């Protein structure tokens, strides 16, 4: 009974970062070999856990969060970072225990003339708490005058499209990101490695 990591890593469509997807991995056997062998990921960074020993560990639960961002922004998917993504879209906690995996997806998520499906939150009054997901689309009020749901001066739509084009520099090309969070609590461990 193997964990459905393929549904996450090999999904055909990915979510926007502001509406990042969370898959709950439980009651299964986790084989993390796909992370070591391939060298098909451009980012593989673990915190609070040893990367090479993942197959020896059991956990209460696993979370697989998935989204798409710019290459320039993959550095923000880590504990203690700041910027538009970490502040307004996807925030890891300082004591994060898990791994961040990312790979370039320019051939899949970029379209000629701009792909407008992937968005990021551009305006927000305060930062996100760790693992907070804000899907609001209310007009952002930048001044004292209320917006009443119409765009205009001091009244911005809070989301902006990445508009991924294949001509983009590597830093502005789309990257697919999966964050594995490892939860160890005083409960039965339902996700163990092989054997």
């Amino acid at each position, epitope marked *: 009974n193997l964990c459905p990591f393929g549904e996450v890593f090999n999904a055909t469509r990915f979510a926007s970062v502001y509406a990042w997807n969370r898959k709950r991995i439980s009651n299964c056997v986790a084989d993390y070999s796909f992370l070591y062998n391939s060298a098909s990921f451009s980012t593989f960074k673990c915190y609070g856990v040893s990367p090479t020993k993942l197959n020896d560990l059991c956990f209460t639960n696993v979370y697989a969060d998935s989204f798409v961002i710019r290459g320039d922004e993959v550095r923000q998917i880590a504990p203690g970072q700041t910027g538009k993504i970490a502040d307004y879209n996807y925030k890891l906690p300082d004591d994060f225990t898990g791994c961040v995996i990312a790979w370039n997806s320019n051939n899949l998520d970029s379209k000629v003339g701009g792909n407008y499906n992937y968005l990021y939150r551009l305006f927000r009054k305060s930062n996100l708490k760790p693992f907070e997901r804000d899907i609001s689309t209310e007009i952002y009020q930048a001044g004292s005058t209320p917006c009443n749901g119409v765009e205009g001066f001091n009244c911005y739509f809070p989301l902006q499209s*990445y508009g991924f084009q294949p001509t983009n*520099g590597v830093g502005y090309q789309p990257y697919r990101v999966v964050v594995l969070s490892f939860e160890l609590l005083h409960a039965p461990a339902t996700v163990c490695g092989p054997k």
Partner: antibody
Amino acid sequence: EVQLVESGGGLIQPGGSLRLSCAASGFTVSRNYMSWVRQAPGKGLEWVSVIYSGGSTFYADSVKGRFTISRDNSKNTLYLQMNSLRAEDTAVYYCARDGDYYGMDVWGQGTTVTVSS
Amino acid sequence: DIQMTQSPSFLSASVGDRVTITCRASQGISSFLAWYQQKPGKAPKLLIYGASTLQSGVTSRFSGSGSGTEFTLTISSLQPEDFATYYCQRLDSYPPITFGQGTRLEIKR
């Protein structure tokens, strides 16, 4: 009225410190990206610093570690504290309400900083 | 870093002319580009954002086009208040933030 009013520029020796102020009207400072951009004599525009509505701050490499951007919400005012000033910091300094994809739409009138021994 | 190069450095034209100035990004940046105007001794004025969206209040004679690496600002009917310096900017409020070095539009004789 929508405006940014700057002050605090002046003449100072290298190694000195200077605080620039930027009072806003027509929008709320704490709810916007706010940037400092400078222009040396006869040169182009150089972005200096930015502060997010959520509080994150960022700096250009040329001033990182020496300048500090901040804000006072009670006065709706942006500040730039400049330490360890150098001759090449000499410039007209502008504040602006930044909008990322929306560009910088509201600019202050600029205040002049001269660093010389 | 992605460089932003404006061309040419100085451009001469007459009142009534149709004028184009170019900004080149060293790498593709989709439509994350702004155009500003600046007269001597005054602060910049936002003309275009999103490569083609005209800032409100700016005259329709200004038009921005291009996407990726080549961007153009076009002034369809030059009026005397248009003689100034014009800057481009990559649109991304995160370091590094880069402006073009500027194009000065001057009176032809």
